[PDB]
Amino acid sequence: DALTLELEPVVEANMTRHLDTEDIWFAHDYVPFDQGENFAFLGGRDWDPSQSTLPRTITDACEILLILKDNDWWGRWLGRWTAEEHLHAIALREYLVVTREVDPVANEDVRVKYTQVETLVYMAFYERCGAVFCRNLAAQIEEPILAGLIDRIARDEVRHEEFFANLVTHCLDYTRDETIAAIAARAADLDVLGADIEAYRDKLQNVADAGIFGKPQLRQLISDRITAWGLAGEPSLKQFVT
């Protein structure tokens, strides 16, 4: 269709950029397997609170990320983007279970319509949320392995945002008032990361209190993203700009 055909040269240029500037990392390289130990089923010991040494703010933030991450040139991009997201989820899970920093039972227990433009706009904001969250988190982590891991993730999220946001720029050029309306509607309705997670109210409040991510960070990044599209004085969006 017509939008897909408009976007293909932009998808190509961005895929080309993303590949030529790639600096590939592996989840397994950020996991201190030497510290791992058998659980009680295999003759070791089960988890208990004494095994966790990281601040609860840091582990709450990581559990939120993990939950979110677990859930044609364009096809080439979606496949690449998907694999990067997946990579993040593996690294986080493996770090967490090897180090025993959280109760692994909790996170392993099986018992517990958008237009195309609307979708690209949503993803640009959502990746920017990811990038701010992981940047702020990495900056508060003193444990160097984990700090390294989260910093890798943050750098990928910057790249994700750049890619989606560039597609949105081409949408603003091809089909302006549609794109603006989509930005207005997302700006009004976006919530903090993990707002949809059942029973995470306490964890969200804790990561907000630490300044990693909350309503103030969300409000500012929304203003910055609108501004970065050159839309800061656009009449229907000035109410989301600080």
Binding residues for Fe cation: 85, 88, 127, 157, 160
Closest contact distance (angstroms) between CB of 85 and Mn ion is 6
DSSP output for 158-216: HHHHHHHHHHHHHHHHHSHHHHHHHHHHHHHH---TTTTSTT-HHHHHHHHHTTSSSHH
Q: Which of 128, 160, 203, 225 binds Mn ion (CB under 5 A)?
A: 160
Nearest-CB residue to Mn ion? 160
Nearer to Mn ion, 63 or 157 (CB): 157
Q: Which of 89, 124, 157, 164 binds Mn ion (CB under 5 A)?
A: 157
CA 38 to chain centre: 31
Give the burial class of 189: count Cβ atoms within 10 A of its Cβ; 0-12 exposed, 13-18 middle, 19 or more buried: exposed
Total residues at interface with Mn ion (CB under 5 A): 4
101: tokens are: 């920093």
Q: Is 161 in the site for Mn ion (CB under 5 A)?
A: no
Q: Which stretch binds Mn ion (CB under 5 A): 16-24, 129-137, 141-149, 182-190?
A: 129-137
Distance, in Å, from the CA atom of 219 to the CA atom of 208, rounded to the nearest integer, reads 13
Closest contact distance (angstroms) between CB of 234 and Mn ion is 26
Chain residues binding Mn ion by CB under 5 A are 127, 130, 157, 160
